[PDB]
């Protein structure tokens, strides 16, 4: 019967449920903790957010060097949403 409600997903969760949440132009990994308070813990630490997009650990993507060559970027995570871009 104990639930969390997430207005960003519009869904009701049980204790221990995990889900993805859209917020602040990023995707968060959230967990319904409950604690009698609908408590939710969410994080972006295990995803990368660059150039307005959201990436998972191991994803790579391309972007022009703001020039004028392409960069290849990779999502590392390392507990702080770390990503790196270098010329290819």
């Amino acid at each position: 019967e104990e639930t969390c409600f997430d207005k960003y997903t519009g869904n009701t969760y049980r204790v221990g449920d995990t889900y993805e949440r859209p917020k602040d132009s990023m995707i968060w990994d959230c967990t319904c903790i409950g604690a009698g308070r609908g408590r939710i813990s969410c994080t972006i630490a295990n995803r990368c957010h660059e150039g307005g997009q959201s990436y998972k650990i191991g994803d790579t993507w391309r972007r022009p060097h703001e020039g004028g060559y392409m960069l290849e970027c990779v999502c590392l995570g390392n507990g702080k949403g770390e990503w790196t871009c270098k010329p290819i």
Binding site: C4, R37, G38, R39, E82, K86
Partner: peptide, 18 residues
Amino acid sequence: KGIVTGAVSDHTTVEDTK
């Protein structure tokens, strides 16, 4: 040539919804 590395601070949140 440039290299760029990004990360996030304040990356983990807790809120109550009930």
